[PDB]
Design a protein around this ligand. Structure first.
Ligand code: POV
Ligand code: POV
Ligand code: POV
Ligand code: POV
Ligand code: POV
Ligand code: POV
Ligand code: POV
Ligand code: POV
Ligand code: WEV
Ligand code: WEV
Ligand code: WEV
Ligand code: OLA
Ligand code: NAG
Ligand code: NAG
Ligand code: NAG
Ligand code: NAG
Ligand code: NAG
Lengths: 204, 204, 46, 150, 150, 150, 150, 150, 150
């Protein structure tokens, strides 16, 4: 019901909400949103904080076979071109037993003041899924039907404004719109000339 | 003006809507959502490379054919009464035909430099394949538009020289000097186009 | 635990561009059509 | 160095310095060359003395080639974002001011060689107005040489 | 210090001070240059004293030349975003008002030398209207020198 | 202090006050300057008395100058967003109302001066209408003063 | 209080109440004032009788000035978003309704003074139409006072 | 209560009820006011009877005043988003249907008083078509009171 | 139920069923109302038999007022997004297809009453074309009924 919330000081730190946290090893799908945001007693073993590096470790002890942990690696750098502080989910990692998953997560960035939010941060790349595996025959797969994570500026134990993932335009649309709205200019140059080839009135 | 009201009605409503949107991204701090970095790096460099080959030849033969029908209506229009024009005044046609020779040469010189790669990350796609993508766009634009302007320049002078040859047959060899200075503009676009793609290598 | 985000759907750039480039493609088709019937010029002295 | 997209603005500074100054040199040669070929039937003696409005429009073409060679040779893989904005603003400043100096040569050079065919007293006055319209492209050059060579 | 794209607005003040004042000095030279060639076919004596409407259009170009050198010589990498907005508005002030002053010199300098041909008494009156249309470029200069030198 | 984008809206009030009042002062000088050259060819005595509609158009030029210096002298690194919006609407309100006052001066000053060539009693009535078109630029001045000084 | 961007919509109600009522008063004194010049050639007696369309077009300008002073005196650092939306709609209600009323005065005041040149019986009828085009600015005033003084 | 920006759509319906209805009331007065001048030189006795098509256009303005007063009295900070969407459609449907009703009055009132000059029998037929073009603004009134008061 | 912005598309169907329909009723009244004013100078007996295109075009406003009442009575708080899109398509298909029937009445009813003055045989044929031109406004009504009941 409530988000996961780690704290080290009297002040609160990194906090993470989802609506359906679900994972799969092989082809067995196990839903975990009932053991995470409702059970109120999580094994946050090392949940680091350093104001430039923060980790969120979730460990469940009842999963595919053995105790299986999930790692959310975040960073917080100063980018010179933007002149801001942009957080980024570095990688998200899972350690089952003597194995590391290494799910790469670009496009889960945003400015440090604001939080992230997306509707599908699932694996199993179809067109634009944000969690990509490092090697393509990957045994692990996970799926977030909702997602909201924040680090490095959590204040008063609640999320800030969300830097959303959707946007008005995607990079596949911007290439298809710069092509369609360019040969629309070629078409209305070639149609303006054929709209003005008027005939004669009389003959001799 | 009937149809120019449509072209000015869209151009006003585009920039008035970018005036309102532009003073609503800054004003409630959403500047970070603009991301001209994300536009230039997530649009494929094969799009800029093939809008350079597509505009080197096609925008040259737009200006090569714009300069032919301007002066070719003055060959046949002025040569009804004086039919000695049609053999001496063909070098006006050739001077706007040669600006399409510079198009097809500089479209297959640029096309030899585009080669595929396999990367998808804007860090894996380094700033050599991005510089090679932008320099092929900016070399087919400076050889397509500079020959679109040169081809109409040697068509307007060639149409005036074909109507001065109709009155006095001795005048054509002296107005031929003006078409020499006009056809040197097209050669100046080829010099810049071979210097924009001199140190360009695309691929990995 | 409060201040949850507004839940925009994942296909928001698709539905935005489907509505935007239709409703100004059906507005320009509507404006050009009603411009031509407004200025019809039937020819009227008799 | 600079970011990956940094060489987009220096490329559009070498393109717009040559494209926009080709449009000025094409208008200055075609608008005035229309006036040369039409005055020549009534005055075939001053046909060679009136070429000089088309060689002044051709200087606008080589004002844009001096900076488009200077930019396209100093451009390398991964320049800074400061140095590419300089060469973009050095490309628009000589191109779009050569487009103005190519318009004011076309309109003056067309009207000048018609008033010279009707009265030969205008030729010293025509080539004095044509210097004022040709230094507009020189002012854009000496501020594109300042901006690009920083 | 400031961001890397701060120098974008600072070179759009060095460009727009030069391209908008050359597009104003082109309209003052071209539009009033057809007025000289239309009046000199009847009055060839008043040629060298009718260069005053195209001389005063040439000072509009060197107003924008001075500001575009002041902006381009006060450029560094990593300037602040506040000083970058000052030089953008210092290019738009001397640029878009020099374009307005060049629009007015072109209209009253063309129509002034048409009425000066029909009457030699308008030459003092035309000059006084040319002064009022040339201080518009001067008013844009003293706001560009105030904004860029803060 | 205010955000880093806040100074953009105050320089675009200092620039929009100057370039929109200059566009109104140019249209009052250009359109009512061709009315002088069409009037004087029959009645050249009222040339210096007809400098009034280009004088009254020249006061609109300094209605925008006295707030383009007033905004550019209240500029500071890090002004608040409320202080920065007051100077945007102080530039847009003396500019676009001074552009309206210069639009009305150039229409009634051109038609009025052409009207006093054939009827000398119109000149005391034309100068009264020019007062009414002058205060449209003055009403924008006294509302740009109570916005900048807040 | 309110958000930091909240004062933008109130300033654009203070300036839109001025620049749209000054554009209505520009079209009122320029379109009617060009009819006074055509009336003056045959009827120079009723010059002072014909400033009434120019006077009543200046009443539209002071309708927009009163609301623009009333909005600009109701401004604070950190007003609510509801209060600044009230003064945006109070600026459009007297600006864009004074632009309509000033357009109507300039059209009937132009044809009215060209109709009283040929028949002075229209003069008592010309003024009676202009009151109906006057109250459109007055109706826009009394909705701008209601919206702003809430 | 509702969101912070919820009062934007209700005040926009309070402004567009007065903006678009005064723009229709002005076109009904301006276009049918030029028809009084063309009628006047032939039939001076029909002056006071031809002020009826601008009286009917004067009721188009008070159709938008009694909806803009009605919205601006029911305004409150924190109205729901549903209640304010009802008053946006209450101002768009009484302004833009009074703009259409004022368009049709200005066209049949202009041509109706042209034919009244050549023939006085049209005056009872012109006053019939002015009624049918008046109730288009009255049909927009009864759909504004449905949407606003509910 | 539905979201808070769901009731916006239903009030844009109550407004556009009255805006776009009173615009078609205004064009059929204005374009044919000049048909009565030009006809009646020749044949002044047909000003009661020939106002039937004005009365026929006064039903296009009523066809839109009917749909704008069924929509504005089915509006309650929290309608779904599905049921609100039906009332948007019921407001455009009766407004923009009444704008079509208001065109075809205004063009036919204009020329039809000129041709009835010169020959009285057209009255049976002119009223037959207004049957086929009015059912375009009725076919949009019975598709607005079939959408609004769902
Ligand atoms: C005429 C008059 C024009 C005046 C019209 C003006 C209309 C614009 C006023 C809207 C601005 C304020 C609205 C707002 O809430 O802020 C938003 C500003 O977001 C935008 O700017 C929306 C527009 C996006 C780009 C559209 C360009 C299309 C131009 C094509 C032109 C072709 C025209 C041809 C004809 C903030 O958005 P957000 O906070 O990021 O939330 C979005 C949710 N998301 C994050 C999931 C994406
Ligand atoms: C006739 C007028 C009608 C005109 C309608 C134009 C609007 C259509 C856009 C809707 C489809 C967009 C789309 O699927 O993107 C596709 C591009 O595919 C393209 O290239 C779209 C280009 C549209 C040009 C249409 C020409 C006609 C690819 O999808 P994506 O966006 O790259 O995937 C990201 C996933 N996400 C969207 C979930 C984030
Ligand atoms: C927002 C505000 C925007 C504009 C507000 C102002 C607009 C008014 C202007 C009206 C335009 C007009 O006049 O129509 C003209 C052209 O009409 C055509 O022939 C059609 C042209 C193509 C338009 C189709 C749009 C669909 C876009 C969808 C794309 C899908 C692409 C899928 C592939 C009629 O021609 P005309 O009357 O003869 O004028 C010439 C007159 N003359 C000959 C005397 C010079
Ligand atoms: C009008 C324009 C007002 C907008 C320009 C202001 C931008 C400067 C402010 C800025 O720093 O950028 C902002 C984005 O800015 C945008 O995203 C807006 C760009 C929209 C396109 C502008 C087109 C103008 C068209 C004109 C039409 C004319 C048509 C005539 C033809 C980002 O601001 P920030 O990053 O949030 O703050 C910096 C803080 N930091 C330094 C700590 C990072
Ligand atoms: C006319 C047609 C226009 C239509 C626009 C209507 C769209 C309403 C959608 C509301 C969404 C919205 O962003 O609300 C915004 C209200 O901001 C406003 O409501 C201002 C309305 C914009 C109109 C500007 C035109 C005036 C120009 C003369 C609040 O945005 P926010 O919550 O503050 O998000 C920023 C939060 N952050 C600063 C932390 C990043
Ligand atoms: C043409 C030129 C237009 C202006 C030149 C822009 C130069 C590109 C720089 C840029 O904007 O991208 C940078 C800032 O991204 C931002 O959001 C900062 C503000 C956006 C641009 C504002 C200028 C608008 C002017 C419009 C006037 C017309 C990208 O930021 P970054 O440093 O790469 O870090 C991002 C973190 N990340 C990598 C995880 C995503
Ligand atoms: C003629 C004009 C006729 C009118 C024609 C208008 C045509 C424009 C149609 C735009 C429709 C877009 C609305 C939409 O899709 O729903 C969007 C929101 O929904 C809204 O917030 C409603 C905003 C409507 C604003 C239009 C008012 C302009 C009228 C001004 C006229 C005044 C003139 C006075 C002078 C859903 O998008 P979202 O991303 O899911 O947002 C959710 C985020 N949120 C919860 C924060 C909101
Ligand atoms: C200029 C043209 C302007 C056109 C501009 C258009 C702007 C583009 C709008 C798209 C907005 C985002 C798309 C989207 O998915 O949002 C919504 C789609 O809901 C819609 O599809 C609304 C589209 C209707 C527009 C019709 C307006 C024309 C009216 C004209 C009549 C005027 C007549 C007046 C007289 C869904 O909301 P969501 O947030 O994505 O759902 C997730 C939330 N949830 C999880 C709670 C369910
Ligand atoms: C041809 O380019 C010349 C100079 C250039 C390029 C100047 C620019 C740097 C200019 O950017 C700016 C405007 C500065 C300026 C001021 C130049 C005046 C120039 C000359 O003026 C001395 C003209 C020439 C007009 C002038 O010398 C005429 C002979 C004349 O002397 C005739 C007089 O009867 C006339 C009254 C007098 C007045 C009009 C100045 O000008 O010559 C030139 O060599
Ligand atoms: C100072 O500027 C004058 C008015 C200004 C600028 C007013 C602003 C403050 C404005 O905000 C408004 C318009 C104040 C206002 C409403 C003045 C009305 C008339 C002026 O009077 C007071 C006339 C008027 C005296 C005079 O100009 C006319 C000659 C005449 O006196 C002669 C009569 O035949 C004529 C019929 C009568 C009518 C036109 C009123 O006025 O003048 C002026 O000087
Ligand atoms: C100018 O002062 C008059 C009205 C003003 C200023 C109104 C607005 C300020 C606004 O407040 C009002 C509310 C607009 C409005 C709702 C006016 C209604 C009716 C009046 O009453 C017919 C006529 C009317 C008394 C009269 O002016 C016409 C001359 C006349 O009525 C009388 C006769 O010549 C003529 C035969 C008759 C016709 C058409 C039968 O038209 O408004 C005036 O006078
Ligand atoms: C999603 C669809 C939107 C785009 C559809 C665009 C198709 C346009 C179709 C027809 C528009 C042409 C109407 C103009 C008629 C021309 C009149 C004439 O030339 O005589
Ligand atoms: C979180 O804060 C509470 C309140 O101060 C504290 O009791 C608790 O120990 C903190 N959590 C950790 C892991 O220290
Ligand atoms: C999503 O969550 C619901 C309950 O919250 C659950 O029944 C369902 O199985 C979940 N989806 C998947 C794919 O597991
Ligand atoms: C924070 O912790 C990370 C990881 O342990 C470390 O690399 C970094 O240097 C630390 N930063 C500070 C300021 O202590
Ligand atoms: C852990 O090791 C056991 C040992 O056989 C294996 O069966 C199990 O599959 C492993 N866990 C996972 C998640 O693979
Ligand atoms: C994938 O993750 C690895 C971590 O080992 C990292 O080195 C690499 O850069 C990532 N690649 C991408 C494309 O994110």
């Amino acid at each position: 019901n409530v988000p996961v919330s780690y704290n080290d000081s009297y002040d609160t730190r990194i906090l993470f909400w989802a609506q359906n946290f679900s994972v799969a090893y092989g082809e067995h799908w196990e839903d975990l949103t009932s053991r995470t945001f409702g059970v109120q007693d999580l094994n946050l073993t090392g949940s680091f904080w350093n104001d430039t590096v923060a980790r969120l470790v979730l460990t469940y002890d009842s999963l595919f076979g053995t105790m299986v942990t999930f790692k959310f690696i975040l960073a917080n750098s100063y980018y010179s071109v933007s002149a801001r502080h942009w957080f980024t989910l570095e990688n998200l990692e899972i350690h089952s037993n003597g194995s590391v998953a290494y799910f790469n997560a670009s496009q889960v960035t945003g400015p440090s003041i604001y939080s992230f939010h997306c509707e599908h941060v699932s694996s199993e790349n179809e067109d634009g899924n944000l969690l990509v595996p490092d090697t393509q025959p990957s045994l692990w797969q996970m799926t977030f039907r909702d997602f909201q994570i924040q680090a490095f500026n959590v204040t008063d134990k609640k999320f800030s404004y969300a830097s959303d993932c959707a946007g008005f335009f995607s990079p596949g649309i911007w290439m298809g719109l710069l092509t369609s709205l360019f040969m629309l200019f070629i078409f209305t140059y070639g149609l303006h000339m054929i709209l003005s080839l008027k005939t004669m009135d009389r003959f001799d | 003006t009937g149809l120019v009201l449509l072209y000015s009605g869209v151009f006003v409503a585009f920039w008035a809507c970018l005036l309102v949107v532009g003073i609503c991204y800054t004003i409630f701090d959403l500047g970070f959502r603009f991301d001209v970095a994300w536009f230039l790096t997530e649009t494929s460099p094969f799009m800029w490379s093939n809008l350079g080959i597509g505009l080197a030849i096609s925008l040259s033969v737009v200006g090569a054919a714009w300069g032919i029908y301007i002066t070719g209506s003055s060959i046949i229009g002025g040569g009804v009464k004086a039919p000695r024009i049609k053999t001496k005044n063909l070098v006006s046609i050739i001077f706007c035909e040669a600006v399409a020779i510079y198009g097809i040469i500089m479209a297959i010189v640029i096309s030899n430099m585009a080669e595929p790669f396999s990367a998808t990350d804007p860090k894996a796609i380094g700033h050599r394949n991005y510089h090679a993508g932008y320099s092929m766009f900016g070399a087919g634009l400076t050889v397509g538009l500079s020959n679109l302007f040169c081809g109409v320049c040697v068509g307007i002078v060639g149409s005036g020289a074909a109507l001065a040859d109709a009155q006095n047959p001795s005048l054509f060899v002296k107005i031929l000097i003006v078409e020499i200075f006009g056809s040197a503009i097209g050669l100046f676009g080829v010099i810049v186009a071979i210097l924009q793609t001199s140190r360009v290598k695309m691929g990995d | 635990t409060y201040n949850l985000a507004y839940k925009y759907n994942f296909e928001y750039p698709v539905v935005f561009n489907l509505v935007l480039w239709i409703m100004i493609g059906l507005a320009l088709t509507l404006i050009v059509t009603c411009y031509n019937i407004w200025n019809m010029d039937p020819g009227y002295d008799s | 160095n600079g970011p990956e997209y940094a060489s987009f603005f220096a490329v559009m500074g070498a393109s717009a310095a040559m494209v926009f100054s080709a449009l000025g040199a094409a208008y200055g040669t075609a608008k005035s060359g229309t006036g040369i070929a039409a005055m020549s039937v009534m005055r075939p003696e001053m046909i060679m003395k009136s070429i000089i409005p088309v060689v002044m429009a051709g200087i606008i073409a080589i004002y844009g080639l001096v900076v488009a060679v200077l930019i396209a040779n100093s451009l390398n893989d991964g320049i800074s974002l400061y140095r590419s904005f300089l060469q973009l603003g050095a490309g628009l400043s000589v191109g779009l001011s050569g487009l103005a100096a190519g318009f004011a040569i076309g309109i003056v050079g067309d009207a000048g060689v018609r008033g010279t065919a009707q009265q030969p007293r205008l030729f010293v006055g025509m080539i004095l107005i044509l210097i004022f319209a040709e230094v507009l492209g020189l002012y854009g050059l000496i501020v594109a040489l300042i901006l690009s060579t920083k």
